[PDB]
């Protein structure tokens, strides 16, 4: 992982590059950056690096050589060694070789193509392919970052960028650092969409496999570990991953509430033989157990008590979506693989007006 | 071949890049056919990025070297003095891998500079890889492993104007050895023929360094290495070594190179002297001390087994430049001594490394790699190559079952420290007064020298203390020259117009040691390999069908025949033009050519100075067919004269010149002091 | 002038650490007076370490070489043709440092090689370094710079035994040369006397590229830089090179070195050959193509400026070691052009320095300092050597006020490119049918040559051939100098015993241009710092005092003068045992010593004579001051470059013209 040095360069027949003047001064980048990690030219030697097919060139020497040429002539034209290495071309040897159709033409500039100085409307295209409730975790993630730059000045000239975007992105930012957005300007203003760049409207997950989910229990409670363990058998079968958090480690149990954090787990059930622990232990952190399932609620994933005090305790409505609570194992199991599948449950959050 | 796993082959196939993409790399991609290059253009990128690195920095001393590969044979199980694996049955055989150097030169340097040379080898044995780093002088110039870089930074190039290449014959490196008299020994030798050698193959390996050899059981014993050559002693004589550095800097590597890819790899005894713990004080000097021999009456030699290199390497730069040696490769058997220069040089070499490879990983070059197994904890580090799989790389532990297992005394086959050395008293920067006697043994060497070869140590001081411009510095030298010798000191002030200094005769003495002489060491005991120039002619056909024959006759023997001509074709290997007595160690003229000794195709004389080189600087000369006195009183040289050959019969003459070839140099032709 | 700052004085004081705490450097920290050292004696560990990391990798080409500082002065306003701020003003100077090199060889093969040689220049100007990386010879060996590596394998040792050394003279480099025919123009240069200059001083320099002049107009002109010796163009012959790469390999750098010390710096007049861009392809061949010159015929020199080094270094590492050129070192009023060769070596020179430095900061290091100050938003990297206080390093800002500002055409006298500069057509990898004559610039430029001179050119070439162990790569070389010139193929052909193959006129013809020959560019116009050993001897009284009066004459004009004899003493240089021939540009026999020419343990049987000889042969002026000895010698009293008197003024005044004709090239045979 850490010696693999990818390149742009590293290109084969069928493929070519265009005139992107990021990708063209990328290449350069990629080769030349490899000197600096490896410390030396024959980074292409590292195992991870090589090739799985034959290399002959004229390449020699330079720090690290791992290999022992057996031609003594590299250098083409030779008879010395027959003309070997061999000229690969498009018509010879399978060689890469540039696109036949591509032409230049006009002074040598260092000019930027006026056809790429729209900068304003795919971004507003993007913006207004996302839900309403990711719009407002955009907005709510530039309020965030914008609020930490000191400079007045810099808030401005910011405002000024995102109003050509969208002025009500400016408005909206602009209320939490306590400046006004300037007037709209609608030269780059549209209402056109694009399929496949919202995260949230892209539906349900495909798959539950790998997702995680994390069972509040409690040692002083045996029902409690029992309801555990019937739990992980049901969710294991579906490919979940679950850990059983309690007060102490012991047969059935993964992880002490002490080292246990919402952030583990893509969902959070309590067993409700351990209602207690919501209502001090050295044992871990004041209001651990509740904290947990607080945040996973506040987080949008899907939360569940199996067994409803509890969600008094927590704040949470029995009736609200992806909320569970189910004396029937399979049941629940049931719904609760819904909830995961659906991921995140977008209600939970404040919109503005 | 030792490295197969790691060669690649080229003889077929389409070009690639480094990832394997078929590729071209005959012309740059234009924006139109006469336009500017592109950025894009990778192909020229990854190719001129590799050329643009290829270089690494040269080694800080021994830059200038060559290597080959061989094994090492064991003649018996030493267990008896040692635990060394690779010592531990007879005939049991260890891959090497050596290399050659000179000393002080750079990089492109000539291999017939006037220097100390390298002598490494490299045991790749089934205990790990033993290093022995040594040199072709058994001494060297300094007591401490903190004065090296100003030994090096003196002898070195003066850091103004980087002059002169490859050669102590300036102030800067005669003031150090004037001021600092522990250099003493070491600059006789390197003033006589050993610092000229005829070849890698007519010298001697020395450890230096008195080490120990450690047994099972935990006793030890002091030892010197010494590699002693199959090949003979040999030297060149000055002014051939300088007509050399011009007309073939790569002298020494293609000798080498020529000697292995014809069957004639070269061969050492590798031997030990061995002592007692209880003689580190009994021979006159203290074993510590890197300045000082043991002589061979106070200790004979124990062949331990034979050296023979019988391969070249495939790529130069991957084996020869790339091989890292240490003296800290040791094996259980092995141990060190508390030499002061040798515990600095553990330092060195470990660090030294890192300059040259780039990153930590040197030792997983292919060159480097051992021949058994590794398991260690080092882990990471850039250009690391391997994948390892224990992911608990630390001791102790039990997530990996405690593995790897600690290797020790008892346990493993461990290295092990000689349970017997100690240390006592207080922390300290003082010299030993052990150490102290700087002259005597350069005395002994010196008087161990023949009169022909004493003339030439002189020879070798008059010329280089000649270029020394400071007269402070030329009288500071014949200060310590005088130490030695007041007869050394007397015939090289005589050179440079000062006056030595009285005889000074705390230091004198008349002793003499076995094994130092070159000129004393008799015949060589095989002339395969060496060089015969047989000067020719194309206006004769007579003369071309002589040296046909006398080819025939010396290659049966296994000399290696160079027929000279004005121009080239068949039969004929060289022209005049490129020719050089430096090329030979023998040199015949057939009687067809004698009208040869003004054309377009040589410079003016040419012929004739081929001849009379070979005669000035020592060498077999011969005219073979009959009629010699035209070429031999055109040359100057006298018909009776010995290592002058004439006969009509080719198998009388090379009979003849073939003892010659043997005797290898007629001393007999350089003028003695009086 | 940034040089001055980092200048370290240690000619007082005790010896520190680098953290400036005063220590030893002796002894070894040990357990006890016999024991073992000690791992906690950091004063030993910091000044190996050092020592263990004091190597940089050598230059992947031109690594053996040796620079000097000194002064460029502009002869004019050059407004008019370039907007160039170091050409804006009559007698406007701007420090530089050039270092001269050979090219194959590594860092410490000899001086005296024949090869293509480095004349690399760095102008500190007011407005940024500019450096013009050019060689000796004025056309490159390929047309595209992909191929350097191809050309530099083949050139350097064969690579399975590193052999042979800073040389052509083998298989490889010979087959290259014969299948990559571009290369024939700079191979001939190569192997004429331009391939073994006699110093870096009697030596042009050529940029070999088209470059433009760029007006603040932005109209623009096609130029050639070449930098005209005003020592002279002089060489040494083949043999003599051979002999001068053993007995000195350090040859060129000493003579610089000595030459600026005695005060006698070497001087150039910096100058174009100026076309317009409409004569691209109007001289016969493409001004794109790098194998190619403009005939003086064509295109008159324009002298712009004169430069001079005076300075040498005062650390080799620091400044000649480490100095690191780049073409892409370029300054408003100079652009490049379209030359695939100049193209791709703008890349090659900033990757390369990352290597040699082991970091990206090589910019920083004293000797490549600009003498303006940097605002730029460059950051961090190893062996970063500044502190920035800008804390906003990108652009476009408003934290830092908008700067640093662009700079461009129009503001802030920013480098521009050409704006009449055009690319058009599909994106490819060919090569210009206009690139395709190789052969009828070799043979304008052998044409050229005197008799003697094209002799030497196919000396060498019959030298270096002969060595070729493959026939069919002999005969491939044959193919390609056939279609140069019958004649070379049939004349190089004989020494190597194969036939020529039969003439192909496509490419010969008659014509000769300007300025190429070396022997044709008549007497040194100069005879300052050229060499004369004096041969002696201190058996005769009379000889020594023969050699002081002609010593304080000779020196009077700036001449170098050594007196040999067999043993050291006041008046005496050099001994027998340490002279050679190839340490003098003239020889005189002072007759006191004629004894000498017919046994001694103070030097090698007939070295006197040896020295004489090898000098009359070489081509060198040759004298006896006060018969014996030129008969012994066999040398011709009335043989051109012989000088026999008794008057030492009238010996003088003879010997002096000869160094100035510098060699007698009538010593020299010729093909029938
Ligand atoms: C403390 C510094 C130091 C000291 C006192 C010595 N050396 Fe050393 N030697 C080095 C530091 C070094 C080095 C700088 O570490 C080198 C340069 C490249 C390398 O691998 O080690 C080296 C290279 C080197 C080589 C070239 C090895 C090769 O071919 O790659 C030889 C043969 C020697 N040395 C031999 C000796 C001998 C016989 C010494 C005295 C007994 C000696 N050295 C003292
Ligand atoms: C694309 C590769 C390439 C090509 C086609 C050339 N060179 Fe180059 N040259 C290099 C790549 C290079 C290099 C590898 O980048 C060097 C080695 C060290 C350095 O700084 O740049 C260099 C070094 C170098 C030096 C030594 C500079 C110094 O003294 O430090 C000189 C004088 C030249 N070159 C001159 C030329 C000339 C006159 C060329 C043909 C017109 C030429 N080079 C083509
Ligand atoms: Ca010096
Ligand atoms: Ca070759």
């Not at chain 2, 004739?608 to 035209?630: H, N, T």
Request: charged share 20%; with cysteine; hydrophobic share 35%.
């Amino acid at each position: 992982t850490e010696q693999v040095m990818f390149q742009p360069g590293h290109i084969v027949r069928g493929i070519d590059f265009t005139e992107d003047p990021l990708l063209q001064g990328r290449l350069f980048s990629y080769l030349d950056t490899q000197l600096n990690r490896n410390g030396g030219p024959n980074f292409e030697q590292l195992p991870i690096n090589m090739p799985r097919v034959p290399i002959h060139n004229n390449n020699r020497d330079g720090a690290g050589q791992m290999f022992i040429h057996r031609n003594k002539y590299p250098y083409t034209p030779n008879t010395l060694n027959s003309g070997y290495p061999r000229q690969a071309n498009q018509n010879a040897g399978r060689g890469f070789f540039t696109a036949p159709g591509r032409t230049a033409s006009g002074a040598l500039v260092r000019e930027v193509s006026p056809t790429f100085n729209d900068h304003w409307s795919q971004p507003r295209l993007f913006f207004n392919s996302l839900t309403p409730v990711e719009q407002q975790f955009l907005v709510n993630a530039m309020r965030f970052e914008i609020s930490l730059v000191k400079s007045e000045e810099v808030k401005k000239n910011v405002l000024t960028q995102l109003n050509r975007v969208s002025h009500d992105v400016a408005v909206r930012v602009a209320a939490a650092i306590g400046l006004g957005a300037p007037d709209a300007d609608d030269t780059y203003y549209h209402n056109n969409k694009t399929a496949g760049v919202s995260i949230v409207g892209s539906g349900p997950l495909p798959t539950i496999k790998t997702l995680r989910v994390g069972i509040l229990a409690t040692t002083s409670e045996s029902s409690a570990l029992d309801q555990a363990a019937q739990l992980r058998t049901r969710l294991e079968k579906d490919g979940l991953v679950v850990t059983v958090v309690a007060e102490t480690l012991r047969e059935g149990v993964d992880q002490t509430y002490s080292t246990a954090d919402a952030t583990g787990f893509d969902g959070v059930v309590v067993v409700d033989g351990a209602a207690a622990l919501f209502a001090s232990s050295p044992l871990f952190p004041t209001g651990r157990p509740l904290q947990i399932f607080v945040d996973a609620y506040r987080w949008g994933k899907p939360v569940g008590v199996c067994g409803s005090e509890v969600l008094d305790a927590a704040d949470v409505p029995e009736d609200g979506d992806g909320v569970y609570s189910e004396e029937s194992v399979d049941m629940f199991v049931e719904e609760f693989e819904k909830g995961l599948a659906t991921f995140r449950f977008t209600d939970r959050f404040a919109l503005d007006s | 071949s030792p490295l197969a796993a790691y060669e690649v082959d080229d003889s077929t196939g389409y070009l690639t890049s480094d990832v394997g993409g078929p590729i071209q790399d005959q012309t740059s991609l234009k924006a139109g056919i006469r336009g500017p290059t592109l950025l894009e253009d990778f192909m020229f990128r990854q190719k001129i990025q590799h050329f643009d690195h290829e270089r690494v920095p040269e080694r800080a001393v021994h830059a200038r070297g060559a290597g080959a590969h061989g094994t090492f044979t064991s003649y018996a199980d030493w267990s008896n003095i040692t635990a060394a694996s690779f010592l531990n049955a007879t005939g049991k055989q260890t891959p090497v891998f050596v290399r050659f150097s000179t000393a002080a030169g750079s990089r492109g340097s000539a291999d017939t500079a006037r220097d100390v040379h390298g002598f490494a080898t490299r045991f790749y044995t089934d205990e790990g890889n033993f290093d022995i780093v040594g040199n072709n002088i058994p001494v060297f110039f300094i007591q401490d492993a903190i004065q090296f870089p100003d030994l090096i930074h003196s002898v070195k190039p003066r850091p103004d104007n980087e002059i002169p290449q490859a050669a102590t014959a300036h102030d800067s490196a005669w003031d150090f050895f004037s001021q600092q008299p522990s250099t003493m020994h070491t600059l006789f030798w390197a003033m006589s023929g050993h610092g000229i050698p005829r070849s890698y193959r007519h010298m001697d390996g020395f450890g230096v360094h008195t080490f120990r050899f450690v047994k099972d059981d935990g006793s030890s014993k002091l030892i010197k290495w010494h590699f002693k050559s199959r090949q003979g002693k040999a030297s060149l004589v000055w002014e051939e070594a300088q007509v050399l550095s011009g007309k073939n800097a790569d002298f020494h590597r293609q000798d080498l190179w020529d000697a292995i890819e014809s069957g004639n790899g070269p061969e050492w005894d590798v031997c030990v002297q061995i002592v007692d713990e209880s003689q580190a004080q009994a021979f006159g000097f203290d074993l510590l001390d890197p300045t000082k021999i043991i002589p061979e009456e106070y200790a004979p030699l124990t062949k331990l087994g034979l050296l023979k290199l019988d391969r070249n390497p495939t790529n130069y730069f991957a084996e020869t430049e790339q091989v890292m040696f240490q003296p800290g490769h040791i094996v259980r058997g092995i141990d060190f001594t508390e030499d002061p220069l040798l515990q600095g040089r553990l330092f060195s070499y470990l660090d030294t490394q890192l300059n040259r490879n780039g990153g930590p990983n040197f030792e997983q070059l292919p060159i480097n790699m051992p021949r058994v197994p590794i398991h260690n904890n080092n882990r990471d580090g850039a250009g690391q190559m391997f994948i390892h799989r224990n992911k608990y790389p630390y001791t102790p532990n039990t997530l990996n079952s405690g593995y790897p297992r600690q290797a020790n005394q008892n346990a493993g086959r461990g290295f092990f420290t000689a349970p017997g050395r100690t240390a006592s008293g207080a922390l300290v920067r003082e010299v030993s007064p052990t150490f102290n006697d700087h002259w005597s043994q350069p005395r002994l060497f010196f008087n161990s020298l023949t009169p022909v070869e004493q003339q030439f140590l002189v020879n070798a001081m008059r010329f280089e203390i000649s270029l020394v411009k400071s007269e402070e510095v030329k009288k500071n030298v014949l200060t310590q020259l005088n130490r030695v010798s007041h007869d050394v000191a007397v015939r090289v002030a005589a050179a440079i117009g000062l006056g030595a200094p009285d005889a000074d005769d705390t230091y004198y003495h008349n002793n003499k040691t076995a094994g130092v002489s070159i000129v004393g060491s008799g015949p060589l005991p095989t002339i395969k390999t060496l060089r015969v120039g047989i000067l020719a002619t194309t206006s004769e056909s007579s003369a071309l069908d002589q040296a046909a024959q006398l080819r025939t006759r010396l290659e049966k023997d296994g000399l290696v025949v160079t027929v000279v001509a004005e121009t080239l074709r068949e039969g004929v290997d060289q022209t005049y033009s490129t020719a050089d007595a430096t090329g030979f160690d023998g040199v015949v003229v057939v009687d067809g050519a004698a009208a040869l000794f003004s054309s377009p195709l040589f410079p003016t004389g040419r012929p004739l100075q081929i001849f009379v080189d070979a005669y000035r600087w020592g060498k077999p000369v011969g005219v073979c067919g009959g009629k010699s006195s035209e070429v031999l009183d055109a040359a100057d040289v006298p018909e009776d004269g010995d290592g002058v050959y004439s006969e009509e019969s080719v198998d009388m003459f090379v009979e003849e010149f073939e003892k010659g070839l043997a005797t290898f140099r007629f001393t007999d032709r350089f003028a003695l002091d009086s």
